[PDB]
Amino acid sequence: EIETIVRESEANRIQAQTWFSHPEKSKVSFRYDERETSSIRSISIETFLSFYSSKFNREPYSVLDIGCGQGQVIQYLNSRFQKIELTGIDSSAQAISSAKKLGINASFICSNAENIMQYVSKKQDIIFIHLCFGLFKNPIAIVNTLIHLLSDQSCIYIVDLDRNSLGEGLNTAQSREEEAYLKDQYRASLTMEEFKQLLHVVTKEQHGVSFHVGNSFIGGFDETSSQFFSLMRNRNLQDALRTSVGEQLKQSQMPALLHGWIIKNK
Ligand SMILES: CCOC(=O)c1csc(-c2nc(-c3csc([C@@H](N)CCCNC(=N)N)n3)oc2C)n1
Ligand SMILES: Nc1ncnc2c1ncn2[C@@H]1O[C@H](CSCC[C@H](N)C(=O)O)[C@@H](O)[C@H]1O
């Protein structure tokens, strides 16, 4: 039962979040994230851009980046499009300070993402939740809120750790502190089993809203999917994929990620 599952794992998520709110821990988390999670960024972004284009045959007018960190995703998107409404939200004041220093045409908000409605009213074409879902105290509540911010043609794209991938995660750790960090992060994560239930519950009563979940490398779409084929026709995604090859080991040696889509098409 997903509501119960989420409630009972709340303490784990609180503990994982200390790695972003406590001064000493935050140094460990930033260093690890920069070194080991930067490579996927381009892939994840080009995946949602290709999805959007394949689904609605236009570029998104707006992107909202949840847990935007130091603004790296927004920076990438800003260099990509001539005109796009970019908004990033993160509860770390240091992170938002860093994002604002980039001097980019974007709105950066420092707040719990739970509070998004206090700052944003315009419906968003894409809401991106990259590598932060398991940090939310109330992840169902935040998703319900974000669904209300979706435009008539839109998606939430969530990429996050799968709890059972801890072992492969630990193989990328380069210190005892990093080991402790990942142990806490993976403990707070969902499994595919849980994540599917979560996506089902938040979408089932919502007219014109559907979901997709998967752990395959490319948006969680497996190689049999017609949506997958459409995604892969996109040159920008193809180029990001080709470029990435030299940074990675065999698939079985890398941590599997959860990929979830909440898709609105009214
Ligand atoms: C290119 C192939 O990619 C890989 O081979 C690869 C190796 S390690 C890795 C990865 N490790 C994280 C991660 C750990 S801690 C964190 C923080 N952002 C906090 C996570 C918060 N979420 C949860 N705890 N659930 N990210 O993200 C990614 C994509 N990917
Ligand atoms: N409730 C919340 N609201 C907004 N941001 C949050 C949050 N809990 C954690 N975060 C932020 O989530 C981020 C996780 S690490 C950075 C994730 C980033 N999206 C990336 O692509 O790598 C941290 O910057 C942390 O400050």
Q: Nearest to residue 125, comparing CAs of 73, 60, 65, 210?
A: 60
C-alpha to C-alpha distances, 88 to 71, 72, 124, 210, 264, nearest whole angstrom: 7, 10, 12, 24, 21
Q: Which of 20, 185, 189 to mutate to test the pocket of ligand 2 (most atoms within 8 A of CB)?
A: 20
Residue whose CA is closest, atom 10 of ligand 1? 37
How many residues can be counted in the chain? Answer: 266
d(CA 60, CA 149): 14
157 neighbors 51 (Cβ within 8 angstroms): yes
The helix-helix angle for 235-244 and 39-56 (nearest 10°) equals 160
Question: Which H/E stretch holds residue 265?
Answer: strand 257-265
Phi and psi angles of residue 228, each rounded to the nearest 5 degrees, phi first: -55, -45
d(CA 206, CA 40): 31
Residue 27 Cα to ligand 2 midpoint, Å, equals 14
| Block residue for tokens 């990093």 | 178
Phi and psi angles of residue 122, each rounded to the nearest 5 degrees, phi first: -60, 135
Sequence ranges of the domains in the chain: 1-266
The response to whether 11 counts as a known ligand-binding position is no
Helix H segments across 57-129? Answer: 72-80, 93-101
The response to whether 12 counts as a known ligand-binding position is no
**Determined by which method?**
X-ray
- DSSP letter for each residue of 215-228: -STTTT--TT-HHH
Contacts of 73 (CB under 8 A, 6+ apart): 41, 45, 65, 88, 128, 130
Q: Which CATH superfamily is domain 1-266 in?
A: Vaccinia Virus protein VP39 (3.40.50.150)
Q: Which atom of ligand 2 is the closest one to the Cα of 128? A: 19
Enter the DSSP assignment of 118.
G
Q: Which of 43, 131, 241, 251 to mutate to test the pocket of ligand 1 (most atoms within 8 A of CB)?
A: 131
How many other CB atoms are found less than 10 A from the CB of residue 193? 14
Where does residue 195 fall: left (phi above 0), alpha (psi -120 to 50 degrees), or beta otherwise?
alpha
| Block residue for tokens 């990438």 | 76
Residue 217 Cα to ligand 1 midpoint, Å, equals 13
18 neighbors 24 (Cβ within 8 angstroms): no
Show the ligand 1 pocket: residues with CB < 6 angstroms: 16, 33, 36-37, 39-40, 131-135, 160-161, 172, 185, 188-189, 248, 254-255, 257
CA atoms within 13 A on the CB side of 105: 10
70 neighbors 99 (Cβ within 8 angstroms): yes
The response to whether 152 counts as a known ligand-binding position is no
